[PDB]
Amino acid sequence: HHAPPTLWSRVTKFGSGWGFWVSPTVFITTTHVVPTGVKEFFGEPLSSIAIHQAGEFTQFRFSKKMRPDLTGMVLEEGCPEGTVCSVLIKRDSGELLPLAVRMGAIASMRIQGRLVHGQSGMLLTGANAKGMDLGDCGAPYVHKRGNDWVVCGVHAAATNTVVCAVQA
């Protein structure tokens, strides 16, 4: 399943990586790419943003509609084992690079001394261009269930194995 243009339009440069608009008001990213010592995100003051973060997953809920062009989509805490997700990687040039990954177990993992609630996966070589393999932290892990796309994690770590941070 190819991610449609509106789905890619949710992937947004943020901090030292990327994040993803789940809805007009909800933005998700990986905690370690979030800038510190700032007074605003996307021009909105801290006092107008509800933060929900843990385990390398960060969610922002803005008090104002920031992306009213978007429908609200489902964010899930990971996905069933064996799901094939696409990691929606974008280059600075705007080139789109969906990377297929076979997902494994949701688990608690220590990664470089930080507690990560995440899901491991293995890149699906057979579903990516030859040689297309491992600043992309925060890219969303998505999959299509029935008629709807679901987001289930944000890119956090890699070595042919990857980990997305997850949160409900």
Side-chain angles (χ1 to χ4, degrees), residues 48-75:
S48 74
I49 309 170
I51 305 302
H52 189 274
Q53 66 200 350
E56 282 298 305
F57 193 103
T58 291
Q59 178 182 282
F60 303 86
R61 181 182 300 274
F62 293 85
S63 62
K64 62 161 76 149
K65 303 183 73 175
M66 297 292 284
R67 287 292 303 273
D69 61 307
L70 299 176
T71 58
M73 64 186 281
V74 173
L75 168 61

mmCIF file of all heavy atoms in Angstrom, residues 48-75:
data_model
loop_
_atom_site.group_PDB
_atom_site.id
_atom_site.type_symbol
_atom_site.label_atom_id
_atom_site.label_comp_id
_atom_site.label_asym_id
_atom_site.label_seq_id
_atom_site.Cartn_x
_atom_site.Cartn_y
_atom_site.Cartn_z
ATOM 1 N N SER A 48 0.330 26.941 25.811
ATOM 2 C CA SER A 48 -0.796 26.561 24.972
ATOM 3 C C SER A 48 -0.672 25.144 24.432
ATOM 4 O O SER A 48 -1.437 24.763 23.544
ATOM 5 C CB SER A 48 -0.924 27.532 23.797
ATOM 6 O OG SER A 48 0.092 27.270 22.855
ATOM 7 N N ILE A 49 0.266 24.356 24.941
ATOM 8 C CA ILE A 49 0.523 23.021 24.412
ATOM 9 C C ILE A 49 0.484 22.028 25.562
ATOM 10 O O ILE A 49 1.183 22.199 26.565
ATOM 11 C CB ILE A 49 1.892 22.951 23.715
ATOM 12 C CG1 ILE A 49 2.065 24.067 22.682
ATOM 13 C CG2 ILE A 49 2.065 21.593 23.055
ATOM 14 C CD1 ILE A 49 3.485 24.180 22.157
ATOM 15 N N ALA A 50 -0.308 20.974 25.407
ATOM 16 C CA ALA A 50 -0.317 19.874 26.355
ATOM 17 C C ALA A 50 0.689 18.836 25.883
ATOM 18 O O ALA A 50 0.643 18.379 24.743
ATOM 19 C CB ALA A 50 -1.704 19.243 26.439
ATOM 20 N N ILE A 51 1.591 18.459 26.763
ATOM 21 C CA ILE A 51 2.686 17.530 26.485
ATOM 22 C C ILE A 51 2.346 16.192 27.111
ATOM 23 O O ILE A 51 1.950 16.140 28.284
ATOM 24 C CB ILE A 51 3.992 18.016 27.136
ATOM 25 C CG1 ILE A 51 4.344 19.434 26.697
ATOM 26 C CG2 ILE A 51 5.128 17.037 26.852
ATOM 27 C CD1 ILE A 51 4.494 19.604 25.211
ATOM 28 N N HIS A 52 2.549 15.110 26.370
ATOM 29 C CA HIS A 52 2.407 13.766 26.916
ATOM 30 C C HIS A 52 3.577 12.967 26.364
ATOM 31 O O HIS A 52 3.554 12.547 25.198
ATOM 32 C CB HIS A 52 1.083 13.121 26.543
ATOM 33 C CG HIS A 52 0.836 11.838 27.264
ATOM 34 N ND1 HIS A 52 1.305 10.622 26.815
ATOM 35 C CD2 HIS A 52 0.200 11.587 28.431
ATOM 36 C CE1 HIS A 52 0.950 9.675 27.663
ATOM 37 N NE2 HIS A 52 0.278 10.235 28.653
ATOM 38 N N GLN A 53 4.581 12.734 27.197
ATOM 39 C CA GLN A 53 5.744 12.015 26.716
ATOM 40 C C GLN A 53 6.227 11.014 27.747
ATOM 41 O O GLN A 53 6.029 11.156 28.957
ATOM 42 C CB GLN A 53 6.881 12.940 26.301
ATOM 43 C CG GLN A 53 7.455 13.706 27.462
ATOM 44 C CD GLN A 53 8.211 14.946 27.037
ATOM 45 O OE1 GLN A 53 8.457 15.142 25.841
ATOM 46 N NE2 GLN A 53 8.591 15.797 28.021
ATOM 47 N N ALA A 54 6.829 9.943 27.215
ATOM 48 C CA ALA A 54 7.456 8.864 27.986
ATOM 49 C C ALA A 54 8.234 7.945 27.032
ATOM 50 O O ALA A 54 7.779 7.703 25.935
ATOM 51 C CB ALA A 54 6.390 8.016 28.687
ATOM 52 N N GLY A 55 9.359 7.352 27.463
ATOM 53 C CA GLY A 55 9.950 6.220 26.726
ATOM 54 C C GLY A 55 10.382 6.502 25.297
ATOM 55 O O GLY A 55 10.338 5.606 24.446
ATOM 56 N N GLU A 56 10.845 7.717 25.035
ATOM 57 C CA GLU A 56 11.258 8.275 23.748
ATOM 58 C C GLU A 56 10.111 8.628 22.819
ATOM 59 O O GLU A 56 10.361 9.040 21.676
ATOM 60 C CB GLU A 56 12.343 7.463 23.041
ATOM 61 C CG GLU A 56 13.717 7.706 23.638
ATOM 62 C CD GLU A 56 14.155 9.158 23.505
ATOM 63 O OE1 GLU A 56 14.164 9.653 22.358
ATOM 64 O OE2 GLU A 56 14.459 9.804 24.538
ATOM 65 N N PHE A 57 8.873 8.558 23.288
ATOM 66 C CA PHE A 57 7.730 9.021 22.520
ATOM 67 C C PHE A 57 7.259 10.351 23.102
ATOM 68 O O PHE A 57 6.996 10.441 24.304
ATOM 69 C CB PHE A 57 6.604 7.994 22.580
ATOM 70 C CG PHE A 57 5.510 8.238 21.581
ATOM 71 C CD1 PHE A 57 5.434 7.479 20.431
ATOM 72 C CD2 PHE A 57 4.560 9.225 21.769
ATOM 73 C CE1 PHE A 57 4.418 7.694 19.504
ATOM 74 C CE2 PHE A 57 3.559 9.435 20.845
ATOM 75 C CZ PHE A 57 3.482 8.668 19.722
ATOM 76 N N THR A 58 7.139 11.375 22.255
ATOM 77 C CA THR A 58 6.581 12.664 22.659
ATOM 78 C C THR A 58 5.354 13.001 21.825
ATOM 79 O O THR A 58 5.405 12.973 20.591
ATOM 80 C CB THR A 58 7.612 13.788 22.536
ATOM 81 O OG1 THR A 58 8.632 13.618 23.513
ATOM 82 C CG2 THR A 58 6.967 15.157 22.755
ATOM 83 N N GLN A 59 4.272 13.366 22.500
ATOM 84 C CA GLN A 59 3.088 13.919 21.873
ATOM 85 C C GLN A 59 2.875 15.351 22.343
ATOM 86 O O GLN A 59 2.962 15.653 23.541
ATOM 87 C CB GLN A 59 1.847 13.098 22.228
ATOM 88 C CG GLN A 59 0.561 13.662 21.640
ATOM 89 C CD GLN A 59 -0.633 12.863 22.047
ATOM 90 O OE1 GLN A 59 -0.888 11.800 21.497
ATOM 91 N NE2 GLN A 59 -1.367 13.350 23.039
ATOM 92 N N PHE A 60 2.554 16.210 21.385
ATOM 93 C CA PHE A 60 2.113 17.573 21.634
ATOM 94 C C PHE A 60 0.646 17.674 21.212
ATOM 95 O O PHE A 60 0.288 17.254 20.104
ATOM 96 C CB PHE A 60 2.914 18.569 20.782
ATOM 97 C CG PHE A 60 4.424 18.522 20.965
ATOM 98 C CD1 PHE A 60 5.216 17.633 20.240
ATOM 99 C CD2 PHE A 60 5.061 19.424 21.803
ATOM 100 C CE1 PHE A 60 6.595 17.628 20.397
ATOM 101 C CE2 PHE A 60 6.436 19.414 21.955
ATOM 102 C CZ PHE A 60 7.197 18.519 21.254
ATOM 103 N N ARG A 61 -0.185 18.272 22.060
ATOM 104 C CA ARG A 61 -1.559 18.602 21.695
ATOM 105 C C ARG A 61 -1.701 20.114 21.798
ATOM 106 O O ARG A 61 -1.665 20.675 22.897
ATOM 107 C CB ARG A 61 -2.590 17.901 22.577
ATOM 108 C CG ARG A 61 -4.028 18.233 22.161
ATOM 109 C CD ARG A 61 -5.063 17.571 23.082
ATOM 110 N NE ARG A 61 -4.952 16.111 23.080
ATOM 111 C CZ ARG A 61 -5.540 15.310 22.193
ATOM 112 N NH1 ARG A 61 -6.300 15.820 21.230
ATOM 113 N NH2 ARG A 61 -5.369 13.992 22.264
ATOM 114 N N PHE A 62 -1.830 20.765 20.657
ATOM 115 C CA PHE A 62 -1.948 22.207 20.606
ATOM 116 C C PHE A 62 -3.369 22.621 20.919
ATOM 117 O O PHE A 62 -4.325 21.929 20.573
ATOM 118 C CB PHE A 62 -1.554 22.686 19.206
ATOM 119 C CG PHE A 62 -0.095 22.475 18.907
ATOM 120 C CD1 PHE A 62 0.387 21.255 18.420
ATOM 121 C CD2 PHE A 62 0.811 23.479 19.155
ATOM 122 C CE1 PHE A 62 1.735 21.081 18.181
ATOM 123 C CE2 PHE A 62 2.161 23.307 18.905
ATOM 124 C CZ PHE A 62 2.622 22.089 18.436
ATOM 125 N N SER A 63 -3.495 23.767 21.590
ATOM 126 C CA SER A 63 -4.816 24.289 21.920
ATOM 127 C C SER A 63 -5.529 24.819 20.686
ATOM 128 O O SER A 63 -6.758 24.819 20.639
ATOM 129 C CB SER A 63 -4.692 25.379 22.977
ATOM 130 O OG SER A 63 -3.937 26.458 22.480
ATOM 131 N N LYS A 64 -4.792 25.246 19.679
ATOM 132 C CA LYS A 64 -5.434 25.692 18.456
ATOM 133 C C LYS A 64 -5.222 24.668 17.353
ATOM 134 O O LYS A 64 -4.255 23.896 17.366
ATOM 135 C CB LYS A 64 -4.954 27.073 18.009
ATOM 136 C CG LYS A 64 -3.491 27.155 17.687
ATOM 137 C CD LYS A 64 -3.193 28.393 16.823
ATOM 138 C CE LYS A 64 -3.198 29.672 17.642
ATOM 139 N NZ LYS A 64 -2.254 30.687 17.089
ATOM 140 N N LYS A 65 -6.158 24.660 16.411
ATOM 141 C CA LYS A 65 -6.022 23.850 15.212
ATOM 142 C C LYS A 65 -4.854 24.391 14.407
ATOM 143 O O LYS A 65 -4.876 25.533 13.952
ATOM 144 C CB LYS A 65 -7.297 23.898 14.371
ATOM 145 C CG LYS A 65 -8.569 23.459 15.081
ATOM 146 C CD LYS A 65 -9.773 23.460 14.132
ATOM 147 C CE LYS A 65 -9.708 22.294 13.138
ATOM 148 N NZ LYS A 65 -10.930 22.213 12.281
ATOM 149 N N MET A 66 -3.821 23.583 14.248
ATOM 150 C CA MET A 66 -2.624 23.958 13.523
ATOM 151 C C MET A 66 -2.637 23.480 12.080
ATOM 152 O O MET A 66 -2.069 24.144 11.200
ATOM 153 C CB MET A 66 -1.404 23.372 14.237
ATOM 154 C CG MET A 66 -1.226 23.924 15.657
ATOM 155 S SD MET A 66 -0.775 25.670 15.677
ATOM 156 C CE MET A 66 0.944 25.529 15.204
ATOM 157 N N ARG A 67 -3.247 22.329 11.832
ATOM 158 C CA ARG A 67 -3.271 21.711 10.508
ATOM 159 C C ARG A 67 -4.695 21.284 10.167
ATOM 160 O O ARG A 67 -5.003 20.089 10.060
ATOM 161 C CB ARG A 67 -2.302 20.525 10.434
ATOM 162 C CG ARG A 67 -0.838 20.936 10.404
ATOM 163 C CD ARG A 67 -0.414 21.658 9.105
ATOM 164 N NE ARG A 67 -0.701 20.835 7.940
ATOM 165 C CZ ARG A 67 0.119 19.909 7.440
ATOM 166 N NH1 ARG A 67 1.353 19.727 7.911
ATOM 167 N NH2 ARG A 67 -0.302 19.158 6.440
ATOM 168 N N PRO A 68 -5.611 22.247 10.011
ATOM 169 C CA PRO A 68 -7.011 21.899 9.717
ATOM 170 C C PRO A 68 -7.211 21.250 8.358
ATOM 171 O O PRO A 68 -8.312 20.758 8.083
ATOM 172 C CB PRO A 68 -7.730 23.250 9.809
ATOM 173 C CG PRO A 68 -6.683 24.227 9.442
ATOM 174 C CD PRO A 68 -5.422 23.703 10.093
ATOM 175 N N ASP A 69 -6.191 21.245 7.500
ATOM 176 C CA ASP A 69 -6.257 20.473 6.268
ATOM 177 C C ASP A 69 -6.346 18.968 6.506
ATOM 178 O O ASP A 69 -6.766 18.244 5.599
ATOM 179 C CB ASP A 69 -5.058 20.787 5.377
ATOM 180 C CG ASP A 69 -3.728 20.450 6.030
ATOM 181 O OD1 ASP A 69 -3.473 20.906 7.167
ATOM 182 O OD2 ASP A 69 -2.921 19.728 5.395
ATOM 183 N N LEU A 70 -5.967 18.485 7.684
ATOM 184 C CA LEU A 70 -5.854 17.059 7.951
ATOM 185 C C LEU A 70 -7.074 16.507 8.669
ATOM 186 O O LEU A 70 -7.621 17.139 9.576
ATOM 187 C CB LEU A 70 -4.656 16.822 8.861
ATOM 188 C CG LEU A 70 -3.315 17.245 8.297
ATOM 189 C CD1 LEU A 70 -2.238 17.053 9.348
ATOM 190 C CD2 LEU A 70 -2.984 16.476 7.036
ATOM 191 N N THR A 71 -7.441 15.281 8.318
ATOM 192 C CA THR A 71 -8.346 14.493 9.141
ATOM 193 C C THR A 71 -7.590 13.938 10.346
ATOM 194 O O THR A 71 -6.363 13.812 10.333
ATOM 195 C CB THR A 71 -8.914 13.328 8.331
ATOM 196 O OG1 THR A 71 -7.826 12.532 7.843
ATOM 197 C CG2 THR A 71 -9.751 13.831 7.171
ATOM 198 N N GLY A 72 -8.331 13.598 11.398
ATOM 199 C CA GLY A 72 -7.729 12.897 12.521
ATOM 200 C C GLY A 72 -7.592 11.427 12.191
ATOM 201 O O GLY A 72 -8.549 10.797 11.740
ATOM 202 N N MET A 73 -6.413 10.871 12.410
ATOM 203 C CA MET A 73 -6.214 9.452 12.172
ATOM 204 C C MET A 73 -5.905 8.745 13.483
ATOM 205 O O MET A 73 -5.716 9.363 14.531
ATOM 206 C CB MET A 73 -5.164 9.199 11.096
ATOM 207 C CG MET A 73 -3.802 9.655 11.464
ATOM 208 S SD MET A 73 -2.625 9.496 10.084
ATOM 209 C CE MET A 73 -2.250 7.774 10.158
ATOM 210 N N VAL A 74 -5.908 7.421 13.424
ATOM 211 C CA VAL A 74 -5.711 6.598 14.611
ATOM 212 C C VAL A 74 -4.225 6.451 14.909
ATOM 213 O O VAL A 74 -3.436 6.064 14.037
ATOM 214 C CB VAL A 74 -6.373 5.226 14.424
ATOM 215 C CG1 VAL A 74 -6.035 4.302 15.575
ATOM 216 C CG2 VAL A 74 -7.876 5.374 14.308
ATOM 217 N N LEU A 75 -3.860 6.751 16.157
ATOM 218 C CA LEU A 75 -2.561 6.461 16.740
ATOM 219 C C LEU A 75 -2.728 5.276 17.688
ATOM 220 O O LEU A 75 -3.546 5.325 18.616
ATOM 221 C CB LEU A 75 -2.044 7.674 17.518
ATOM 222 C CG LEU A 75 -0.838 7.481 18.439
ATOM 223 C CD1 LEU A 75 0.395 7.020 17.686
ATOM 224 C CD2 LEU A 75 -0.546 8.776 19.187
#
